[PDB]
Amino acid sequence: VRWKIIESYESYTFIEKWEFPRNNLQFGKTLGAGAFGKVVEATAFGLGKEDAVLKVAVKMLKSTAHADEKEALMSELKIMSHLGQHENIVNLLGACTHGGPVLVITEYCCYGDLLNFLRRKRQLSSRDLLHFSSQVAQGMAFLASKNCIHRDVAARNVLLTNGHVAKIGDFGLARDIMNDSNYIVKGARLPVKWMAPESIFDCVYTVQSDVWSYGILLWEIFSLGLNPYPGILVNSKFYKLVKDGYQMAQPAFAPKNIYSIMQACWALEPTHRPTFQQICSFLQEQAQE
Numbered sequence: 259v260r261w262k263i264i265e266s267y268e269s270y271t272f273i274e275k276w277e278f279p280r281n282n283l284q285f286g287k288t289l290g291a292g293a294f295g296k297v298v299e300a301t302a303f304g305l306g307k308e309d310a311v312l313k314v315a316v317k318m319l320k321s322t323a324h325a326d327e328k329e330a331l332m333s334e335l336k337i338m339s340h341l342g343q344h345e346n347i348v349n350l351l352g353a354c355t356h357g358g359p360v361l362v363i364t365e366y367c368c369y370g371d372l373l374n375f376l377r378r379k380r381q382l383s384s385r386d387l388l389h390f391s392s393q394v395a396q397g398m399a400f401l402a403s404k405n406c407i408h409r410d411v412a413a414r415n416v417l418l419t420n421g422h423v424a425k426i427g428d429f430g431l432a433r434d435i436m437n438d439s440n441y442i443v444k445g446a447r448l449p450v451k452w453m454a455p456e457s458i459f460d461c462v463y464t465v466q467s468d469v470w471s472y473g474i475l476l477w478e479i480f481s482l483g484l485n486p487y488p489g490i491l492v493n494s495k496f497y498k499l500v501k502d503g504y505q506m507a508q509p510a511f512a513p514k515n516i517y518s519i520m521q522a523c524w525a526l527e528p529t530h531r532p533t534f535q536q537i538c539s540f541l542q543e544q545a546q547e
């Protein structure tokens with residue numbers, strides 16, 4: 259769904275410098291769009307203290323959006339302005355909230371999404387896959403430290419920028435959810451194959467829930483982009499399987515130790531799942547290549 263700050267975990271949750279001239283923005287092609295929003299590539303002139311002309315990403319609402327939509331965009335803006343910067347996050351760089359529609363300026367990731375990258379690379383080395391894994395875990399450990407839940411951890415939501423470095427961000431407003439069959443209609447469109455059981459059955463969303471999803475992301479990375487639960491449709495049988503403890507088989511390119519992380523992330527009991535900080539350390543130790 260969308261990023262959100264929750265109460266207590268790990269740390270402690272206690273709670274217009276970003277304004278940029280929209281005329282100093284030169285819009286380019288649209289990168290993606292959803293039911294009520296879209297993100298476009300653009301060039302910003304004189305942005306930041308370095309007065310760069312760098313290429314950036316600009317998120318904005320569509321004509322079909324109303325108050326509720328506008329608030330969600332402002333809320334994301336507010337969350338990003340509060341989180342602070344991190345190397346593996348699609349960082350906020352500015353915003354245009356006056357003199358026209360609200361625009362949120364973030365870093366642009368030239369290589370696009372990790373899922374498509376893996377599919378066109380089926381060269382990639384085992385070391386590269388481990389790096390992708392570590393960078394996302396670093397970003398997730400960062401969010402966890404700010405009591406921020408992601409709720410849509412998946413390879414399609416990991417972007418690659420200069421140096422093929424992975425970054426995560428809230429792409430919900432530009433995600434084409436209505437036409438993506440991976441988002442299952444539920445009353446709501448949810449990425450069921452990536453969701454933890456408690457999120458599916460109890461509608462509970464916590465950092466541990468994102469850990470489960472991170473395990474599914476690992477399976478996507480080490481299978482070089484296969485759709486999770488291959489050939490299995492989302493329905494009663496699927497839900498019964500996951501609830502009953504079913505887990506996907508080890509991916510073709512995952513070393514046993516990496517598969518062990520997936521299994522840990524998929525522990526049915528949320529408190530039996532590792533933390534993102536523990537995952538980072540294990541990956542740091544390499545565990546396996």
Ligand SMILES: CC1CCN(c2ccc(CO)cc2NC(=O)c2ccc(C#N)o2)CC1
Nearest residue numbers: 289290297315366367368369370429432433
């Ligand atoms: C939901 C999808 C997220 C990724 N997507 C991009 C596709 C291709 C490229 C490379 O040309 C870049 C993409 N996106 C970004 O660099 C970026 C920064 C912030 C956002 C947001 N939302 O998307 C299209 C929409």
